Design an enzyme around this catalytic site. Structure first.
Site, short mmCIF file in Angstrom:
data_model
loop_
_atom_site.label_atom_id
_atom_site.label_comp_id
_atom_site.label_asym_id
_atom_site.label_seq_id
_atom_site.Cartn_x
_atom_site.Cartn_y
_atom_site.Cartn_z
N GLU A 163 4.82 1.43 -1.94
CA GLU A 163 3.96 0.87 -0.91
C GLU A 163 2.65 0.38 -1.49
O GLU A 163 2.06 -0.58 -0.97
CB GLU A 163 3.70 1.91 0.18
CG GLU A 163 3.04 1.35 1.43
CD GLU A 163 2.43 2.42 2.31
OE1 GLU A 163 3.15 3.38 2.66
OE2 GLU A 163 1.24 2.30 2.64
N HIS A 164 2.17 1.01 -2.56
CA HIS A 164 0.89 0.58 -3.12
C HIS A 164 0.96 -0.81 -3.74
O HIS A 164 -0.02 -1.55 -3.69
CB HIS A 164 0.38 1.59 -4.14
CG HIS A 164 -0.45 2.68 -3.54
ND1 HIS A 164 0.07 3.64 -2.70
CD2 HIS A 164 -1.77 2.95 -3.65
CE1 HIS A 164 -0.89 4.46 -2.32
NE2 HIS A 164 -2.02 4.06 -2.88
N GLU A 200 -7.36 8.69 -6.18
CA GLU A 200 -7.30 8.94 -4.74
C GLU A 200 -6.87 10.37 -4.43
O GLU A 200 -7.15 10.86 -3.33
CB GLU A 200 -6.34 7.91 -4.16
CG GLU A 200 -6.09 7.85 -2.67
CD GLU A 200 -5.61 6.48 -2.24
OE1 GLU A 200 -4.48 6.10 -2.62
OE2 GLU A 200 -6.37 5.77 -1.55
#
Ligand SMILES: CCCCCCCCCCCCCCCCCC(=O)OC[C@H](COP(=O)([O-])OCC(O)COP(=O)([O-])OC[C@@H](COC(=O)CCCCCCCCCCCCCCCCC)OC(=O)CCCCCCCCCCCCCCCCC)OC(=O)CCCCCCCCCCCCCCCCC
Ligand SMILES: CCCCCCCCCCCCCCCCCC(=O)OC[C@H](COP(=O)([O-])OCC[N+](C)(C)C)OC(=O)CCCCCCCCCCCCCCCCC
Lengths: 77, 32, 418, 45, 104, 423
Positions: free
Chosen positions: F60-61, F137
């Site tokens: 998804e990134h 993150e």
């Protein structure tokens, strides 16, 4: 484009304020728990100055000095 | 952060009444 | 099937639209807000929006609360500096009694001493949850810096006033500003005859206009707030244009040329001039964008930045310079067309949902004699030239600035040195 | 009282009737078993 | 009709027999503080609250001293103030409304 | 004039079709100048093993970072030059990519949407950049406490089963996942009969179907070697996880039992129950979380540290009340709240598109509002009593707590609160 929301885009939620009243059927986002600010020290009440004779000499003429002592009250010029 | 979470395994302690799995879950609960 | 504007002898405006939706929505909109307060009764309107379930001459507080719950409905209140709105949502057939409640809340409130005095401590709490997001208090300061009197007044109650807003103030404000010629009633999911039956109850309410207020006067202010936070927030604006103006459309297109906000999840915003400018001045996390507000007698345009504390001076400058290049007339047809695309598309997306559509119609009804359909808005957008955009940029560059900053300001610049 | 005449109270009483007569059975049989009450216990096979 | 004057006559007799006027007290002072009465007392404005408190302390002091006020200062039947009744009626209405909701 | 239920008949139908490769196309046309179009995919974290837990989030990134036909930022620039928006998400059980746009742009939209799901350019440089970003993150405490306690709940409830594992996965894995893993993941899970193409707004169904055949019809459908991973069957455990930290301002708490899943009818009645329940503390909620064969049914709250016990008492008492003593008057209110919620949610194209996709994955079919209304109308106090008893009464719960949680009751004390001695 005459409402804040249609005009301002992503700044609309800070240019507008809302309160949703009695609780509704759906559940809102950004619930926001509340760690409120602590209370300051409690102090004696202030006296008024409702005469010229009592205000005379209150205006400042020189900047201030801060003072403290080990067996004397702390003081300000 | 948290995402690395995982409960350690309890295999030694659990009952055989759920390891012999040929019966729906809630019916098992009832037997126990 | 279309909208139908109409005005009663009282001066009240009414409009409706029978979309065949299962959920009906009715809004009562009023020309009121914080701009009509003065230094002696600040915070009144905040408590007023929170007091929207205290007892009335027509129905008990217990009755209002439980009766609205028993059908699943909602009664919201929303404000700005210039307008207030009371909105009701209900299933088909629920209208009548909820309309009684709306009428009593707006035309016949009691402000019983004990209920008001029990309601006070919630101002603190509401303001706190609002002030968790840092953007809100920065924008509040920006209005204080930008204006001397009216648009300067805060949306949330001042701290020194909590616990000392009185019932008499509430009564006075309602009596002098909740007047029929300041009002419109809008209905989605409702046939005009039915909305006429509703509006009929408002025929004997307070008539005419009220206290008109004062015009806003501009300040070239500057407010600095020092905290320990490693991130610093900043806003830099000037005065732009009045609501509903061609020049305001020019300013909107300029905003979208500079960059108004993201479009791709986790994207680089390669189309955005401000973001790409800044990205070459700092190597740690930043945010930047352009800012627009418009009012009845003023407006603000500028830039908004978030950066590390030691990088602020480089960021704020890098952003500002970008605008200047447009003022000098480095501007391209391609950028302008793309900006107008962003703007037309964003506008049409903003009104998919009935909630925002109702708001937009109600905003128009308080200021214009007829509803403007979106096609006309899109044409007005289409009609902005390049020269208008460049002129707007020159106005910003030339005019007197206002600024706010919050954080650790050891390296933030002062408005005089930008 | 006069307060407790109404629909909710009727529904609420109906909700608890079965538990009531079950506790009644418990108490009756226990009393009999505890006092070797032949009047009831002579009918138990 | 005359019946009004007659009933008011017996009512005045009963009032003088009760004798809380000898202590300088109003009728609404003498109520027992059940739940509703306490809530009605909560709702009073400051002046009435303070007047009530002092009147009651004064009666208690007199009772301590097995004494009464001079006759000139007794509370008279024709010029008394039922200051608490209105608030109490509202409190009771509210409770009745809630009860009535609770049976549906 | 109509009735609510009669207005529910005017809502338009959802058309559905199939391609030859088994991809299904679904649409609802609403005559507007704006539209939402997306692809929903029947894949999520509960299909990953401990060797590649966290692959979908990684993918998804870098989904929107370039395709072969559109290297690098060309795709981003073309999306932004239309004035359109592009978004994605990933769940314990589903994945989705959609676009918001003008109805005029449907041919391009679908094109881009097909270019994204078949032709992402998994370049080493971009993989390493995303690796660094995800590690950064994860390093700092960038998680909200709510997310923490819900992750803890899934871990304790579904321990030893794939559903216990998180969407992001462990950090040890993101510093160790390779391009081979990513491409194997895609080849094994991204197959036509697991995909839905959904559209809402000013979209005509046959045009969408033509575009789907043109741009999505070459996606394969032959599952090979049954290469799909073998995994553990479902089980729910009554258990607790406690993470104590007396420096945090407030205590967070979550408590569930096991729910029935998407397919069962009982869900409706349960929702009504929820609406009846939802002062002591700052914040409180009830919830139902559904999966294919199981679920979580419970509540979440925040308290001051000295008021956890009372709050637990109140909550469990309301549960017992509903199981034993419900009445008609409150049930009616709950049904009305549920009606209002259902109709409020489906406002605008995006939620509607999303509902189409999720529905065709979970139910096999779009359920119209009229059917939901008919199902709601049948509930009554007797049904609530029965079904609450069937899932709540005398059951072992799963508990999670984070904060200053000294006063959170002992597990035996909590278990004994799930039944009454006077019943
Ligand atoms: C001696 C040696 C000493 C040294 C020894 C050394 C070693 C010691 C080590 C061990 C130490 C242990 C320490 C104690 C631990 C206590 C734990 C605890 O309290 O946990 C709290 C525990 C935790 O829950 P929680 O978190 O607090 O939540 C509260 C909720 O409300 C939860 O709600 P709920 O619904 O789940 O539960 C509520 C309900 C749950 O209980 C029930 O609903 C029923 C339980 C089973 C049936 C028991 C019925 C007893 C009825 C009275 C006796 C008559 C029986 C029939 C015969 C009739 C004869 C005419 O219980 C109650 O409401 C309490 C009262 C229940 C009985 C009702 C009668 C009250 C009056 C009693 C006096 C009567 C005298 C006259 C009798 C007639 C004339 C002779 O919850 C409780 O409330 C537990 C209740 C415990 C009740 C015990 C009752 C014992 C007394 C019986 C009667 C005795 C007199 C008999 C006279 C002769 C006639 C037969
Ligand atoms: C006045 C004199 C005559 C009195 C006669 C009395 C008649 C009634 C006797 C009833 C006895 C059985 C009652 C059981 C109640 C259980 C309730 C409960 O909480 O159980 C679950 C609890 C807890 O179990 P648990 O926690 O494992 O799980 C229970 C959960 N459910 C209910 C869902 C299964 O169990 C107990 O610990 C109960 C212990 C009870 C001990 C009673 C001892 C006997 C005392 C009475 C007999 C002696 C009388 C002597 C008279 C002499 C006269 C001359």
């Amino acid at each position: 484009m005459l409402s804040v929301a249609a005009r301002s885009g992503p700044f609309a939620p800070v240019l507008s304020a809302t309160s949703r009243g009695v609780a509704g059927a759906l559940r809102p986002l950004v619930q926001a728990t509340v760690p409120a600010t602590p209370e300051p020290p409690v102090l004696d009440l202030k006296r008024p100055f409702l005469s010229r004779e009592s205000l005379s000499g209150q205006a400042v003429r020189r900047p201030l000095v801060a003072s403290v002592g080990l067996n004397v009250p702390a003081s300000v010029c | 952060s948290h995402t690395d979470v995982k409960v350690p395994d309890f295999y030694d302690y659990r009952r055989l009444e759920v390891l012999d799995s040929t019966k729906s879950s809630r019916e098992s609960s009832e037997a126990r | 099937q279309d909208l139908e504007f109409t005005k009663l002898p009282n001066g009240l405006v009414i409009a409706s639209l029978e979309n065949y939706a299962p959920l009906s929505r009715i809004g009562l909109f009023i020309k009121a807000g914080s701009r009509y307060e003065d230094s002696n009764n600040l915070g009144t309107t905040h408590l007023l929006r929170l007091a929207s379930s205290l007892t009335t001459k027509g129905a008990s507080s217990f009755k209002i609360t439980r009766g609205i719950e028993a059908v699943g409905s909602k009664l919201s209140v929303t404000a700005t500096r210039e307008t207030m709105a009371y909105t009701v949502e209900c299933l088909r057939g629920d209208v009548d009694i909820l309309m009684e409640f709306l009428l009593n809340v707006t035309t016949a409130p009691e402000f019983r001493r004990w209920e008001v005095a029990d309601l006070q401590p919630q101002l603190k709490i509401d303001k706190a949850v609002a002030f968790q997001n840092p953007q809100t208090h920065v924008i509040e300061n920006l209005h204080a810096a930008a204006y001397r009197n009216a648009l300067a007044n805060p949306l949330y109650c001042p701290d020194y006033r909590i616990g000392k807003v009185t019932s008499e103030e509430l009564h006075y404000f309602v009596q002098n500003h909740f007047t029929s010629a300041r009002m419109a009633l809008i209905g989605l999911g409702v046939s005009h005859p039915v909305l006429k039956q509703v509006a009929e109850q408002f025929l004997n309410m307070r008539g005419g206009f009220g206290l008109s207020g004062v015009k806003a006067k501009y300040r070239g202010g500057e407010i600095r707030e020092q905290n320990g936070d490693s991130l610093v927030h900043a806003a830099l604006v000037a005065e732009s244009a009045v609501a509903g103006s061609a020049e305001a459309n020019a300013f909107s297109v300029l905003q979208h040329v500079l960059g108004a906000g993201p479009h791709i999840k986790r994207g680089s915003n390669t189309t955005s001039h401000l973001y790409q400018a800044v990205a070459k001045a700092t190597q740690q996390p930043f945010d930047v964008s352009a800012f627009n507000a418009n009012y009845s007698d003023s407006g603000l345009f500028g830039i908004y930045t978030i950066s590390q504390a030691t990088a602020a001076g480089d960021v704020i400058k890098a952003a500002y310079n970008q605008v200047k290049t447009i003022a000098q007339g480095n501007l391209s047809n391609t950028d302008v067309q793309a900006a107008k695309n962003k703007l037309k598309a964003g506008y049409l997306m903003s009104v998919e949902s009935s909630e925002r559509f109702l708001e937009e119609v109600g905003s128009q009804a308080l200021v214009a004699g007829s509803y403007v359909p979106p096609s006309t808005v899109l044409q007005q957008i289409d009609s902005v030239a390049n020269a208008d955009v460049i002129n707007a940029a020159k106005k910003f560059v030339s005019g007197q600035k206002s600024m706010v900053a919050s954080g650790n300001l050891g390296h933030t610049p002062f408005v005089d040195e930008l | 009282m006069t307060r407790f005449l109404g629909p909710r109270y009727r529904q609420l009483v109906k909700n608890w009737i079965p538990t009531a007569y079950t506790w009644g059975a418990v108490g009756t049989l226990g009393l009999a078993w505890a006092a070797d009450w032949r009047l009831i216990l002579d009918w138990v096979p | 009709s005359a019946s009004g004057k007659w009933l008011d006559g017996i009512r005045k007799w009963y009032y003088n027999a009760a004798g809380f006027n000898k202590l300088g007290l109003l009728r609404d002072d003498t109520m027992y503080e059940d739940e509703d009465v306490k809530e009605a007392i909560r709702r009073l404005p400051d002046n009435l609250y303070n007047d009530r408190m002092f009147r009651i302390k004064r009666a208690l002091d007199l009772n301590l001293k097995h004494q009464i006020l001079p006759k000139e200062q007794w509370t008279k039947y024709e010029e008394e103030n039922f200051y608490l009744e209105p608030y109490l009626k509202e409190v009771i209405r509210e409770r009745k409304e809630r009860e009535e909701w609770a049976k549906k | 004039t109509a009735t609510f239920a009669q207005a529910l008949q005017f809502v338009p139908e959802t058309q559905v079709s199939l391609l030859d490769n088994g991809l299904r196309v679904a649409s609802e046309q609403s005559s507007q100048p704006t539209c939402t179009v997306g692809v929903w995919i029947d894949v999520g974290s509960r299909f990953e093993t401990e060797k590649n837990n966290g692959a979908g989030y990684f993918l998804e990134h870098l989904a929107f970072k370039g395709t072969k036909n559109r290297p690098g930022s060309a795709l981003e620039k073309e999306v932004e030059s239309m004035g359109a928006h592009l978004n994605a998400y990933s769940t314990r059980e589903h994945t989705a990519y959609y676009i918001k746009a003008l109805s005029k742009d449907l041919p391009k939209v679908v094109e881009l949407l097909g270019d994204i799901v078949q032709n992402c350019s998994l370049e080493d440089s971009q993989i390493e950049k995303e690796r660094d970003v995800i590690l950064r993150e994860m390093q700092e405490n960038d998680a909200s406490m709510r997310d923490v306690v819900f992750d803890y709940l899934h871990a304790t409830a579904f321990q030893g089963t794939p559903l216990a594992q998180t969407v992001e996965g462990p950090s040890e894995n993101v510093r160790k996942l390779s391009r081979a893993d990513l491409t194997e993941y895609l080849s094994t899970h991204y197959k036509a009969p697991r995909m839905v193409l959904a559209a809402a707004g000013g979209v005509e169904h046959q045009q969408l179907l033509d575009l789907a055949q043109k741009h999505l019809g070459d996606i394969p459908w032959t599952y090979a070697e049954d290469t799909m991973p073998a995994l553990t069957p479902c089980r729910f455990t009554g258990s607790e996880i406690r993470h104590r930290d007396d420096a945090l301002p407030f205590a967070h708490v979550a408590i569930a039992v096991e729910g029935p899943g998407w397919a069962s009818p009982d869900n409706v009645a349960l929702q009504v129950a929820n609406a009846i329940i939802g002062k002591l503390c700052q914040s409180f909620q009830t919830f139902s979380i559904c999966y294919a064969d199981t679920g979580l049914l419970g509540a979440h709250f925040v308290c001051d540290r000295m008021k956890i016990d009372d709050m637990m008492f109140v909550l469990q008492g309301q549960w017992m009340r509903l199981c034993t003593s419900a009445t008609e008057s409150e049930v009616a209110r709950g049904k009305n709240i549920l009606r209002n919620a259902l109709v409020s949610h489906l406002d605008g194209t995006t939620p509607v598109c999303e509902d189409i996709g999720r529905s065709l994955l979970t139910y096999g079919r779009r359920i119209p509002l009229a059917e939901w209304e008919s199902r709601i109308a049948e509930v009554d106090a007797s049904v609530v009593r029965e079904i609450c008893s069937k899932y709540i009464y005398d059951q072992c719960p799963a508990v999670a707590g984070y904060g200053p949680i000294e006063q959170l009751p002992d597990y035996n004390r909590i278990r004994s609160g799930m039944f009454w001695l006077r019943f």
